[PDB]
Design a protein around this ligand. Structure first.
Ligand SMILES: OC[C@H]1O[C@@H](O[C@H]2[C@H](O)[C@@H](O)[C@H](O)O[C@@H]2CO)[C@H](O)[C@@H](O)[C@@H]1O
Ligand code: CL
Ligand code: NA
Length: 472
């Protein structure tokens, strides 16, 4: 039983728009912050790579559905490119070509018995909105509402699963370095917190919008996808345990405390540590933005499920390090990784499958067992079809998740593997491979071909169990 998926559990795979679509300026699409980064700052990206073509999924979406059907995916999670739909960011102009494209993908999926799951924002902000300051500027909350309305109106008759934002803990860091993630702004400890504040407001506006304008007719569900690493105490001390709790609150709780708790607001430890640090460093005002009581009430409860993006673990010990000001410094933990853990092609990603089970339990206890949909989980290598490391990564993580479900009572309701295919890996370009399908980026046809991991995942999806040969 511990090796069998619940009957209603949904299995599939996932992608993101900039990572796969290409057609970056085709048929009216406007520029986004990733177009800007890869065009203006190729020195920030391995090989000077761009997403101009990527997997060419704008043209090849039927091939994506074909491989999803082969895989036996029940669900496909993909994102919508804001600037493909609203080229100016604001809702004054709707690009029919973008409407047609996503309709064509949705219809193709449904005709092949695959459910669409749509992420509204996976990091590709229209440049016109970044030029107002981007996420640190609260005006973007209403702009996000208006974007979401166009999506609900056009697609919500057929799309019943939505995520507002993907991994805002990661994308907020685009406001914490001059050479980092788009838009590559150096405001650590100040602008990144403002970005988070706006995103939380935006998410809440989108959820209320669904309630007010769409839910009764459409009957779908709206969540948010949060990334989080497990943080294991470096030793069993109370002090090291405290540092790991700090980590969870500063990374997951930053977003999840305002939305998923009865109390709402940011975690107390976040408010208190930033307040103290700001005062000590001479600021009149805390660097952490504040919610009013009315905003706290508006934001709390804005969820039908929790999306989780899980990859890895860190070790945490008591202490403070990092630059002043920064979120890492404010968090009051010293982070390392254990040399013994298996590696990947990504410096940040080590294989720690039991950390997945620990994280799922932490979430269950902190948020009163919300329905959890694993929206990303996956592994990098440098290439190859005989991807034994990736096969092991998936079979172990899925076993740990199934223990969380069956042994620990965690309400996990679905899982989409990251990623369906090798794609543009952000600042790493095409150098790191996360796909279960390989893609030849030197071949203009961008053929997708199954790796061993795709064959193993198909077997899991078909049999609805972990095969015997992968069991402990
Ligand atoms: O692009 C791969 C994957 O990255 C995720 O972010 C990583 C980040 O790169 C790393 O520095 C940090 O320690 O861990 C996070 C994951 O928690 C991002 O969240 C994913 O959405 C993305 O697909
Ligand atoms: Cl066997
Ligand atoms: Na419209």
């Amino acid at each position: 039983t511990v090796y069998t998926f619940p009957d209603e559990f949904k299995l599939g795979a996932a992608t993101a728009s900039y990572q796969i679509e290409g057609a970056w300026d085709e048929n009216g699409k406007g520029p986004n912050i990733w177009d800007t980064l890869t065009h203006e700052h190729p020195d920030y990206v391995v090989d000077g790579a761009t997403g101009d073509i990527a997997d060419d999924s704008y043209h090849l979406y039927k091939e994506d559905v074909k491989i999803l059907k082969e895989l036996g995916a029940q669900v496909y999670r993909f994102s919508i490119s804001w600037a493909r739909v609203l080229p100016e960011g604001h809702d004054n102009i709707v690009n029919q070509d973008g409407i047609d494209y996503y309709n064509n993908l949705i219809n193709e999926l449904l005709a092949n018995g695959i459910e669409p799951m749509v992420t509204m924002y996976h990091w590709d902000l229209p440049q016109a909105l970044q030029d107002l300051g981007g996420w640190p500027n609260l005006v973007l909350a209403k702009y996000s509402e208006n974007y979401a309305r166009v999506l609900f109106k056009n697609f919500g008759d057929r799309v019943k699963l939505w995520l507002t934002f993907n991994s805002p803990l990661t994308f907020m860091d685009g406001y914490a370095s001059e050479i980092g993630m788009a838009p590559s702004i150096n405001t650590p400890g100040i602008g990144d917190y403002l970005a988070a504040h706006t995103v939380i407001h935006a998410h809440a506006r989108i959820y209320h919008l669904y309630d007010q304008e769409f839910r009764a007719e459409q009957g779908g569900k709206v969540g948010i996808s949060l990334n989080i690493n497990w943080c294991e105490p470096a030793t069993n001390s109370a002090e090291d345990r405290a540092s790991c709790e700090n980590y969870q609150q500063f990374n997951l709780g930053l977003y999840a405390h305002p939305i998923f708790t009865e109390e709402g607001d940011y975690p107390a430890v976040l408010k208190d540590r930033v307040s103290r640090n700001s005062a000590d460093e001479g600021y009149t005002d805390s660097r952490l933005p504040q919610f009013t009581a009315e905003e706290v009430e508006y934001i709390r409860g804005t969820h039908d499920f929790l999306g989780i993006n899980f990859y890895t673990a860190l070790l945490g010990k008591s202490g403070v390090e990092g630059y002043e000001p920064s979120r890492y410094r404010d968090s009051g933990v010293i982070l390392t990784q254990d040399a013994a853990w298996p590696i990947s092609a990504s410096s940040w990603l080590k294989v720690v499958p039991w950390g997945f089970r620990k994280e799922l339990n932490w979430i269950k206890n902190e948020y009163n067992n919300p329905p959890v949909f694993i929206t990303e989980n996956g592994f990098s290598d440098y290439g190859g079809l005989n991807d034994t490391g990736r096969v092991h990564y998936y079979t172990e993580h899925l076993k740990e998740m199934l223990k969380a479900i069956h042994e620990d009572g965690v309400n996990v309701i679905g899982y989409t593997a990251w990623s369906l295919m090798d794609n543009f890996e952000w600042l790493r370009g095409y150098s790191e491979k996360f796909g279960i399908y390989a893609v030849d980026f030197e071949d203009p046809a961008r053929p997708r071909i199954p790796k061993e991991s795709a064959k193993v995942l198909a077997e899991i999806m078909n049999t609805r169990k972990i095969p015997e040969r992968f069991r402990d």
